[PDB]
Ligand binder design. Structure first.
Ligand code: HEM
Ligand code: CL
Ligand code: CL
Ligand code: CL
Ligand code: CL
Ligand code: CL
Length: 152
């Protein structure tokens, strides 16, 4: 279920994200590369990337746009961490494009983990981060299952 963060937890999440927020596209490019490299089945889900070597596409506009759009959503979730409705709406809106798609919970959860590992959080910040991401996935998976109206 959705579990709100305290004011102090919100501050923890903002602080946890601040290095990435400060280098959003550069972090996005690195994290997205590492994700595709570690979990190579996923590149095929991106039709603009499909059929080419990862090292050939990593420097391209198409690739950087995708990595950017993922990170922009998380950046906006963070921005909305103190507003449950606003946070839910960010996710609600990005969920539609995903509903019809052959992407497993495993694939999304593998991306969450690459992000986690890149942030190297202490346990206090990590706990607050994981409250937010647990909310993220709760909302996202509810919308993938066609129960996205409940957040409206
Ligand atoms: C969980 C965090 C994610 C976020 C915040 C996110 C965000 C977005 C956004 C903003 C779009 C743009 C809407 C569009 O033009 O379709 C999009 C599209 C899309 N995403 Fe995601 N995404 C996430 C995870 C994933 C994963 C893990 C995959 C594949 C394994 C994936 C595959 C796709 C595909 C295939 C599209 C449709 C557009 C296209 O053909 O590239 N997404 N996503
Ligand atoms: Cl894989
Ligand atoms: Cl490859
Ligand atoms: Cl994406
Ligand atoms: Cl607010
Ligand atoms: Cl930390």
């Amino acid at each position: 279920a959705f579990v709100g963060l305290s004011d102090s937890e919100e501050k923890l999440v903002r602080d946890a994200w601040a290095p990435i927020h400060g280098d959003l596209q550069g972090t996005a490019n690195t994290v997205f590369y590492n994700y595709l490299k570690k979990y190579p089945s996923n590149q095929d889900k991106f039709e603009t990337l499909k059929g080419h070597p990862l090292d050939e596409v990593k420097d391209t506009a198409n690739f950087k746009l995708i990595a950017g759009r993922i990170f922009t959503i998380f950046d906006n979730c963070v921005k909305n961490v103190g507003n449950d409705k606003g946070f839910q709406k960010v996710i609600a809106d990005m969920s539609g494009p995903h509903v019809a798609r052959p992407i497993t919970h495993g694939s999304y959860n593998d991306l969450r983990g690459v992000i986690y590992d890149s942030m190297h959080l202490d346990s206090t910040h990590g706990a607050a981060w994981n409250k937010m991401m647990d909310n993220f996935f709760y909302v996202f998976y509810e919308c993938l299952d066609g129960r996205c109206s409940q957040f409206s």
